[PDB]
Amino acid sequence: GPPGPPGPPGPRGQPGVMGFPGPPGPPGPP
Amino acid sequence: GPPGPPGPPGPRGQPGVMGFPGPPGPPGPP
């Protein structure tokens, strides 16, 4: 017979990887 | 004629963007 219909859209991709650490904080007080 | 079975889901999407960098750290010590 004729082909079946196409399947549905593929799954959403995985989330991105975790980001870099932030920079060091600001200086302490005198 | 008799159409075939539905196809499978499509390819998985591409990965997401890497996470943003973290915020600045705590203030320093005296």
Place this chain on the structure above:
Amino acid sequence: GPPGPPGPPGPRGQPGVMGFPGPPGPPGPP
């Protein structure tokens, strides 16, 4: 009939988790 084609490509994944806060800042002045 034969199975249908695979479906369309999936969408991009979500952005990743933001990175950790940075470490504590440098010592303050004397």
